[PDB]
Amino acid sequence: STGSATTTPIDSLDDAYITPVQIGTPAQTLNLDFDTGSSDLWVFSSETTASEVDGQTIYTPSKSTTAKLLSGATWSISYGDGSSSSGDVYTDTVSVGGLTVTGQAVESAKKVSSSFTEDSTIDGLLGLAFSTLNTVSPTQQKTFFDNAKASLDSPVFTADLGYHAPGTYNFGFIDTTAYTGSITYTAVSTKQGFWEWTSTGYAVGSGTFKSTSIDGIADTGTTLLYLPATVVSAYWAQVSGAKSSSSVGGYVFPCSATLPSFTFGVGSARIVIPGDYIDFGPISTGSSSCFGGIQSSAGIGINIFGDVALKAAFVVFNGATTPTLGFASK
Numbered sequence: 001s002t003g004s005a006t007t008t009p010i011d012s013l014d015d016a017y018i019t020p021v022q023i024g025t026p027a028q029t030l031n032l033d034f035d036t037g038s039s040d041l042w043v044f045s046s047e048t049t050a051s052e053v054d055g056q057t058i059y060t061p062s063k064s065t066t067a068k069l070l071s072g073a074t075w076s077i078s079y080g081d082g083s084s085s086s087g088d089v090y091t092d093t094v095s096v097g098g099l100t101v102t103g104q105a106v107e108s109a110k111k112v113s114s115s116f117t118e119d120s121t122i123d124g125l126l127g128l129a130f131s132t133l134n135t136v137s138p139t140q141q142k143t144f145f146d147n148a149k150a151s152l153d154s155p156v157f158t159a160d161l162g163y164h165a166p167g168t169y170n171f172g173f174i175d176t177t178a179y180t181g182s183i184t185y186t187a188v189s190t191k192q193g194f195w196e197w198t199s200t201g202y203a204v205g206s207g208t209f210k211s212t213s214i215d216g217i218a219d220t221g222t223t224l225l226y227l228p229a230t231v232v233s234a235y236w237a238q239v240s241g242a243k244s245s246s247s248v249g250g251y252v253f254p255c256s257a258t259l260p261s262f263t264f265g266v267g268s269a270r271i272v273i274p275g276d277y278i279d280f281g282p283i284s285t286g287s288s289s290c291f292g293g294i295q296s297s298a299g300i301g302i303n304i305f306g307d308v309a310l311k312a313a314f315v316v317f318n319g320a321t322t323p324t325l326g327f328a329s330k
Contacts (some may be wrong), residue, residue: 001151002172003099007034007161010121013280014307015223017161018121019169022095023106024064030057030123034169035221036159036195036317037304039133039143040077041094042085042107043124044116052112055120059108066102067092075107075136080222080300083115089136094144096126099171101148105134105141125221128157128317133193145171145319155319159220160330161311163277179314179328184269188323192302194219195317197325199305200267202227204235205260209270216303218310218317218325224280225262225273226297226304235262235294242292248283251292255282262294264309266327273312 007019018031023043030043044053046060061067067090076086087110094104109116109124116122127134131142149155152172160178161167168178189196194217201211214227232251236242238260242253253259259275278293293308316326 001099001148002153002170003095003097003148004168004170005097006166007169008166009162009164010119012164014161014164014311016122017167017220017307018123019096019126021126023059024061024092025066026064027095028057028059028064030059031121032124032126033122033221034126034128034159035219036128037217037219037221038077038079038125039127039129039131039193040075040107040135041105041124041126041144042075042077042087042109044112045087045108047087048109049111052117054117057123059106059124061090061092061106061108064092067106070105070136070139073105073136073139073141077135080304081115083113085109085112085116087111089141096144096171097169099148099152101144104144104147105136107136128220129195130190130193132190145317148172149319157317157319159310159315159317161220161307163274163311167311174316179330181329183314183316183326183328184266185316185318185324185326186266188325190323192217194302195323195325200265202231202265203263203270204238205275207238209263209265211265214264214303216297216305218305218315220307220310222304222306223308224304224306225294225308226300226306227294228303229296229298232294232296235260236292244296248289248291250295252283252289253292255288255290257290264305269327271309271313271327271329273309277308277312
């Protein structure tokens, strides 16, 4: 089997992407944030504290003839941005782009933090990291991809995120029309539960490529590109007036600037992020200070190849017995 679903930016900045997901019988369609940096499929629901729901579409298990309470199971998750959610668990039928999994753990939110409530466009998350990170207790649950894998034509999914435009998540096949050149594959460590890999270096604009190993994770659920402070300083030093602002929380730059591109290495191959992809617009409405899309990872503990980097590529998440990542230009 295969599936194919369009993923759409939630706003004009590509802060995140939503993909429609069918849950239950009859189908209830929710727009979920596919997150290769976490491993829980959780949804706003009929159980979510009413004051914490503000415009989201909710899953109502009592209206699904295939929903079953997973008795005793609870979940609770905290994300790198400080947001969080928790609740109980049902199993139900879940379909993405025509690919159906029966018995998928659907984690129903009883509580969500304010950032979730405040984002009316995201009805929940669909985790695509390794199932060892799943938070369900006392019996850890499998991701949608893990459950689908055996049925897929090939044990892979691909992320093709658009810049200010829709893109595609495919399951079970590699669309050879969706990229240019060849796909370069690179080793993955699953030791931390992430799609963790080592970039071979970087360049700023038309500058020379610096060969240096950068360990990080491919994370569709993180907006920006978080890299070591040395690398980030080298990038922003090429932008007149750019500076790191402790009050804003990162590098800012004059909105009048033209940003240089940023290249990262995948083995001997190179992925070029155009300068425009690094512009996240005014820090506040009407400001002439703009927020940078490349930021330091120094306070995180890990480097994160988020959407800024991934949307410059066609990315293969290869879930073979030994997982690997593939990157192609597009």
